Amino acid sequence: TYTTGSFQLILGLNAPQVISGEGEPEGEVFASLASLEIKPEAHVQELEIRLDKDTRYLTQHTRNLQPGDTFHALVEPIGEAPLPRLRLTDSGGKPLAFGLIDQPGESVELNYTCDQDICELVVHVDGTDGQKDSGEAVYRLLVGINAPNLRESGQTPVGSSVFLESDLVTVGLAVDQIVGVDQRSENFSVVGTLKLSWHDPKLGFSPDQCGCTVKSFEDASIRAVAGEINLPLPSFSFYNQQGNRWSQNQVIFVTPDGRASYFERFTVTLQAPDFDFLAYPFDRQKFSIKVDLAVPTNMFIFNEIERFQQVVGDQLGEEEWVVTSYSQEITEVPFERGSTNSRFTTTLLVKRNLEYYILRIFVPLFLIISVSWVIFFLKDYGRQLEVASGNLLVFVAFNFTISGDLPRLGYLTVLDRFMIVSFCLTAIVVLISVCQKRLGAVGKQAVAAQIDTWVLVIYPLVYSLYIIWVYLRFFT
Amino acid sequence: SVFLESDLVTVGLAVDQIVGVDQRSENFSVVGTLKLSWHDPKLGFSPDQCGCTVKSFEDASIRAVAGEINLPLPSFSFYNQQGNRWSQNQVIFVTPDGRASYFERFTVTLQAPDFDFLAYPFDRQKFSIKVDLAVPTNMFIFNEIERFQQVVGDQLGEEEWVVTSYSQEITEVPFERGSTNSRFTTTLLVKRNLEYYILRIFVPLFLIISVSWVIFFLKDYGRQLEVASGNLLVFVAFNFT
Ligand SMILES: CCCCCCCCCCCCCC
Ligand SMILES: CCCCCCCCCCCCCC
Ligand SMILES: CCCCCCCCCC
Ligand SMILES: CCCCCCCCCC
Ligand SMILES: CCCCCCCCCC
Ligand SMILES: CCCCCCCC
Ligand SMILES: CCCCCCCC
Ligand SMILES: CCCCCCCC
Ligand SMILES: CCCCCCCC
Numbered sequence: 001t002y003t004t005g006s007f008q009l010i011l012g013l014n015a016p017q018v019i020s021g022e023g024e025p026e027g028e029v030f031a032s033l034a035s036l037e038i039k040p041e042a043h044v045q046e047l048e049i050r051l052d053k054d055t056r057y058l059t060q061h062t063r064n065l066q067p068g069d070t071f072h073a074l075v076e077p078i079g080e081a082p083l084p085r086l087r088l089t090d091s092g093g094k095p096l097a098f099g100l101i102d103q104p105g106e107s108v109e110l111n112y113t114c115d116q117d118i119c120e121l122v123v124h125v126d127g128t129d130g131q132k133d134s135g136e137a138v139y140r141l142l143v144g145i146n147a148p149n150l151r152e153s154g155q156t157p158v159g160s161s162v163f164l165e166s167d168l169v170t171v172g173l174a175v176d177q178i179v180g181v182d183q184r185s186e187n188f189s190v191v192g193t194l195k196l197s198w199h200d201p202k203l204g205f206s207p208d209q210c211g212c213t214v215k216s217f218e219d220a221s222i223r224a225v226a227g228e229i230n231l232p233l234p235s236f237s238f239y240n241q242q243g244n245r246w247s248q249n250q251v252i253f254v255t256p257d258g259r260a261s262y263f264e265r266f267t268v269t270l271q272a273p274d275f276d277f278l279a280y281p282f283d284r285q286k287f288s289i290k291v292d293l294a295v296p297t298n299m300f301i302f303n304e305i306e307r308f309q310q311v312v313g314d315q316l317g318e319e320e321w322v323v324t325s326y327s328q329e330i331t332e333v334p335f336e337r338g339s340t341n342s343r344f345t346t347t348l349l350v351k352r353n354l355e356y357y358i359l360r361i362f363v364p365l366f367l368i369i370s371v372s373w374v375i376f377f378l379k380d381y382g383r384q385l386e387v388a389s390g391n392l393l394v395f396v397a398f399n400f401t402i403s404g405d406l407p408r409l410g411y412l413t414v415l416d417r418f419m420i421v422s423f424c425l426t427a428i429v430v431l432i433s434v435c436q437k438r439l440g441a442v443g444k445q446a447v448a449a450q451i452d453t454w455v456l457v458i459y460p461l462v463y464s465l466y467i468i469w470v471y472l473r474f475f476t
Numbered sequence: 477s478v479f480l481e482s483d484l485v486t487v488g489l490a491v492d493q494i495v496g497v498d499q500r501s502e503n504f505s506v507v508g509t510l511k512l513s514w515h516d517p518k519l520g521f522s523p524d525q526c527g528c529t530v531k532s533f534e535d536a537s538i539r540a541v542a543g544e545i546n547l548p549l550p551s552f553s554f555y556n557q558q559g560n561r562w563s564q565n566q567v568i569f570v571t572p573d574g575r576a577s578y579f580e581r582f583t584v585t586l587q588a589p590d591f592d593f594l595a596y597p598f599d600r601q602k603f604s605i606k607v608d609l610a611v612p613t614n615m616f617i618f619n620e621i622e623r624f625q626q627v628v629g630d631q632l633g634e635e636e637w638v639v640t641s642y643s644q645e646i647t648e649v650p651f652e653r654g655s656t657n658s659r660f661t662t663t664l665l666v667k668r669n670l671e672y673y674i675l676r677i678f679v680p681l682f683l684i685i686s687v688s689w690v691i692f693f694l695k696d697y698g699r700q701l702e703v704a705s706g707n708l709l710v711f712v713a714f715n716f717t
């Protein structure tokens with residue numbers, strides 16, 4: 001490949017000390033720059049911009065200009081959009097030029113020339129004349145350096161970009177194991193791996209001063225390395241991190257071309273305010289992992305997603321939570337002190353193990369309810385009363401035996417409501433048994449038999465109607 | 477003005493989630509955001525000495541920045557903070573004119589000695605969050621309240637505690653070495669979920685009491701005694717459940 005960088009050149013004429021590399025300037029000059037003999041090279045760039053209702057002000061940064069250079073800019077609307085205002089300022093905001101409306105008033109033009117040793121220019125395009133919400137006005141912006149022919153360029157954009165571009169960062173994340181879910185405080189913990197990669201020529205170095213191909217930094221965060229080497233680096237954080245984060249194998253290494261990458265193995269706890277356990281245990285939850293860059297989008301921005309490993313890893317044995325699907329996306333979110341920062345989000349859809357709850361809870365409850373129902377075939381009401389009294393205690397014993405699988409959230413779930421209804425019906429069975437015993441005692445066995453038939457007909461219908469109502473009110 | 481004036485500070489606070497209440501130690505934990513803003517010409521600078529419009533400090537408290545730049549700054553503290561406080565996105569940035577602002581996302585645990593659970597579970601509680609400036613009122617003072625977001629935020633799902641109303645106020649409290657310091661107080665009025673307790677406790681208890689009451693219609697007193705003896709055990713079982 002080729003190479004890039006700055007250089008120092010020493011030329012001598014009949015001065016044998018030059019080959020030592022230490023020749024100090026002397027005598028009268030004899031050579032000069034060749035490029036000064038002709039007209040300088042031009043760079044032209046064109047961009048399309050849109051001024052939304054809340055984005056009526058836009059600014060762009062230009063590369064450094066050497067003394068003697070010239071700067072031109074022009075703006076022309078795509079359609080019937082009104083002509084916006086244009087002006088040029090330095091990096092501090094000191095005004096330098098203002099746009100002029102041409103006699104064919106369909107465009108605004110600007111011009112400037114460089115005087116200082118180094119000039120940094122910023123172009124302002126704004127349409128905040130008033131407060132009208134025009135909508136989707138769109139304009140075409142043409143800008144060039146040493147290009148006085150921007151009116152009729154003819155050629156496609158040549159040279160290099162006039163405006164600075166943001167550094168592109170490739171990110172990737174993998175989840176290894178879900179290590180816990182807290183249902184009262186609404187947070188969960190996860191173990192996984194994170195990887196970042198970006199290219200920056202300012203970090204490149206020359207091998208001949210170290211005799212190596214790889215330079216690495218270990219056991220330090222990106223912020224610490226950036227503060228040590230006095231260069232901007234793409235720092236990040238977890239948006240919903242709770243407490244400190246444990247990290248392993250944290251390393252940053254760079255190549256002489258300037259390609260750098262970051263690696264980390266983490267165990268973190270994340271807050272999840274969106275949890276909803278109303279449909280417990282048939283609830284479905286979303287595990288979202290958010291990674292936000294701590295720099296404005298004009299410096300660094302996520303560009304691509306890398307799948308270095310499987311996003312969700314397989315492990316031996318069964319799990320409490322089963323992942324159904326996953327997704328990854330890159331978006332933009334508002335940032336402090338204006339501007340915008342990049343966000344990388346990984347979402348997991350999970351559900352519980354249904355067979356566990358079904359076999360452990362519902363079948364024994366059904367059997368207890370059946371025991372309470374079957375006793376109405378007997379015509380000896382003392383035995384019926386005794387068995388009902390025993391079955392109520394059996395129901396309470398089973399309820400407190402399974403109490404370990406009953407979350408205490410401060411609000412009702414489906415299981416709690418079902419248990420309450422079953423307990424109420426079981427107690428009503430004992431009440432009806434007492435009433436039938438008294439009726440048989442007074443000599444009205446026919447009424448007791450009729451009540452038995454009525455209960456036998458009614459109870460399963462009531463249970464089925466309650467189940468249908470719960471399904472209607474919680475699952476559709 | 478002939479006399480010196482105090483610097484005016486704008487304060488705002490929001491609550492995102494109540495993450496826990498400790499009823500024996502009388503403390504609770506909350507997650508939220510805090511924002512401060514003030515104006516000071518002594519912090520102003522010229523752009524041509526840095527080539528930038530914003531000067532920023534990150535991951536540092538107000539006290540640390542004040543010690544580093546050797547200028548007085550409006551430091552603050554939580555009055556009833558228990559243990560250390562977790563902070564994220566902590567940043568201070570200043571404009572050339574001298575306008576400064578502070579931002580922080582916090583998770584803190586606060587002592588609440590005013591808790592009263594005599595009327596449990598029908599009790600109502602107050603959650604008070606107090607922010608006090610660590611400087612005398614002749615240097616800095618809270619002047620305005622900024623509502624950058626909703627004071628109480630909505631979240632998916634049900635909550636154990638339901639917020640009925642909120643309020644914000646600025647007052648003055650005695651300060652060490654005399655003088656006075658400003659205080660910013662946010663109060664939340666909360667109540668429990670009544671349906672949970674009612675349906676889970678009171679209906680079964682009423683049914684058990686009814687079972688014990690209904691047996692006096694019988695004239696066979698052996699059955700009545702047996703059912704009463706069984707119902708006492710059932711009551712004990714429900715109580716411990
Ligand atoms: C309540 C527990 C379920 C028991 C099965 C009920 C099936 C419906 C049978 C209805 C029979 C009525 C005979 C008088
Ligand atoms: C104690 C559980 C409540 C049962 C209902 C009582 C209602 C009052 C009825 C009084 C009837 C007296 C008949 C001799
Ligand atoms: C596990 C829930 C069982 C509830 C009672 C079933 C009654 C069905 C009657 C047809
Ligand atoms: C609260 C339940 C009331 C049941 C009353 C039973 C009447 C029985 C008299 C023979
Ligand atoms: C998706 C499964 C729907 C559950 C409806 C019936 C619940 C009965 C009470 C536990
Ligand atoms: C974890 C198994 C899902 C539900 C299976 C139903 C079998 C009772
Ligand atoms: C043999 C027991 C049947 C239990 C059915 C209720 C659970 C789906
Ligand atoms: C929704 C809970 C109702 C509790 C009692 C039902 C008695 C049939
Ligand atoms: C959380 C519900 C408040 C009380 C409702 C009463 C219904 C039994």
Ligand SMILES: CCCCCCCC
Binds near residue numbers: 674678679682683
């Ligand atoms: C308010 C709770 C006591 C009444 C329970 C009635 C049960 C049907």
